[PDB]
Write a protein that binds this ligand. Structure first.
Ligand SMILES: [Ca+2]
Ligand SMILES: [Cl-]
Ligand SMILES: [Cl-]
Lengths: 127, 165, 169, 126
């Protein structure tokens, strides 16, 4: 029964600098703030931080880890809250919020110790 | 001054379609799934992709924006709508930047070898607003990606340009 | 010193590692990433017409990218027949926990084309020591690396490192 | 044929963190010391520093910048020296040291604030 309320397994990710830098560059985002601490600090940011293309990719991964290889992602909408700085750990949680004829909606929240880093809504079809 | 620049950019219309530096390709998929840590086999194994109903390996949907990034060597086209706005804020001291919202829709999955193009339009620029990082302006942008004349994905996203406190 | 020489001999007796295929064939997207970061504007790496004017069959890879193709990547683990693993353990166990690369000599037999699939094989060469060095007592370890496309040797490298005892050892 | 003693134009390169990080990752070298300051410092280094594969590529670039697109690089040998840390500038200099039947040998040195960062011998045809 694809169930409204279904809970996705937790995913905890440690944002060490290798993670932040490698994801930013693999998304072809060379903005200094994701790999140059001095440039992040120059804009008042605490340290380097994860970029939004990586947030989108991680939300996708989190949902398909649960949904499986046959899942077809239709849309991802997200809003950022607090930054994901080097050495923060983000814990992803998720819940199915809608099921309508093969089409499922999942709410995802990634939280770090301070607060909600990312809040996302994902629409997908599952087989 | 800001809103005049915004009007002038909007009036120029959506940017002329620009081809991604590379077609969708396995080496870049490999780099991305490696860093993101996404072990979904459909991005790296043809047989897995076929068991999931695809013709062969497909690209992760969330890689759409990756294909058309400028990177280090890319030179922005003259009709780029976002570049001039970024420059205006930078020159005025709003050198801080953070992306704040991203909504992407994926019409279908892309295959290695397909050539993506991008067209972008400047949305509303809103401010000045007092944020946790300082005074700033939110810049909205709508992007469409095509393969040939077929729309394959769309994005609305928002970035904050701000003066650091 | 005696047990070290004996251990090295047993490692060498296994011969070179079996050829290990590069993750990807030589490819334009990775050439692009590399020339952009290095800042090398040589047109033969990005323009077929320019490459042909220089006598190549089409765009060629930068020779200095040879080692890039076969890098293990994030969290990569060397194969069970790589002689470097056992050598590093041997010297770590003997207290030489420090390491620095000292020399790298690469020879390129020809230029590679996008689509070509490279493999790598590694052989242990001279192991010399103990020596007094500016970094501390250490042993020098040489390796001969060979890259192939199929059965054709396309490049090779002599790689030398120093395993040394740090100041507080 | 060029001749022994011919000098190459100088090339100065600023090692900003973007340069160091982007080159290391474009060479598929994910060693923490090239992109993680805390890990570089943790191991007793001053800051992040340029990797060896980038040295090889820069030496190649330096020589082909001078010799042109038709140059065929036959070998690059490096003797590694002092580190090239973030915010230091390396100046490359070069001199032709040998000409043997179409094969040119060039000695290249990259120097920074700390001394000789890399000494290279490049064989090419021109
Ligand atoms: Ca800026
Ligand atoms: Cl971003
Ligand atoms: Cl290195």
């Amino acid at each position: 029964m694809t169930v409204v309320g279904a809970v996705l397994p937790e995913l905890k990710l440690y944002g060490d600098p290798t993670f932040i830098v490698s994801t930013a560059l693999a998304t072809r985002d060379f903005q200094d703030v994701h790999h140059d601490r001095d440039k992040a600090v120059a804009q008042g940011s605490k340290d380097i931080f994860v970029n939004i293309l990586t947030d989108t990719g991680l939300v996708q991964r989190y949902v398909t880890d649960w949904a499986g290889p046959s899942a077809l992602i239709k849309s991802i909408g997200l809003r950022l809250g607090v930054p994901w700085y080097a050495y923060d750990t983000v814990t992803f949680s998720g819940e199915v919020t809608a099921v309508n004829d093969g089409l499922i909606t999942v709410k995802v929240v990634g939280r770090n110790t301070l607060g909600d880093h990312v809040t996302a809504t994902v629409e997908l079809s599952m087989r | 001054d800001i809103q005049e620049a915004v009007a002038q950019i909007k009036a120029a219309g959506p940017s002329k379609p620009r081809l991604a530096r590379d077609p969708v390709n396995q080496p870049m998929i490999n780099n991305w799934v490696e860093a993101i840590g996404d072990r979904n086999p459909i991005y790296v194994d043809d047989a897995a992709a076929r068991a999931a109903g695809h013709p062969g390996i497909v690209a992760p949907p969330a890689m759409i924006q990756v294909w058309t990034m400028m990177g280090l060597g890319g030179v922005r086209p003259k009709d780029d709508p976002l570049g001039p706005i970024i420059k205006l804020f930078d020159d005025a001291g709003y050198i801080g930047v953070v992306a704040t919202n991203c909504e992407q829709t994926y019409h279908r999955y892309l295959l290695p070898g397909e050539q993506v193009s991008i067209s972008a339009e400047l949305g509303d620029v809103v401010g000045p607003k007092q944020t946790a990082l300082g005074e700033g302006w939110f810049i909205n942008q709508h992007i469409v990606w095509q393969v040939g004349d077929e729309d394959v994905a769309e994005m609305n996203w928002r970035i904050l340009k701000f003066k650091p406190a």
